[PDB]
Symmetry: C2
Subunit: 31 residues, 2 copies
């Protein structure tokens, strides 16, 4: 598999972690 696939996977994982962080912050503040 091309190392390019690994970089796209990293971008997806980072996206998910950011979204989940934001989701947890929304729950904390009641949003």
């Amino acid at each position: 598999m091309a190392q390019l696939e690994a970089k796209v996977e990293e971008l997806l994982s980072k996206n998910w972690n950011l979204e989940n962080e934001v989701a947890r912050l929304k729950k904390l503040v009641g949003e």
Copy 2:
């Protein structure tokens, strides 16, 4: 240009918007 490029661009832009949101939240709370 392949529509695939547009999707990767969307992923990058979303990543940037999430990071910038988190960065602004850190500034708000003093982190």
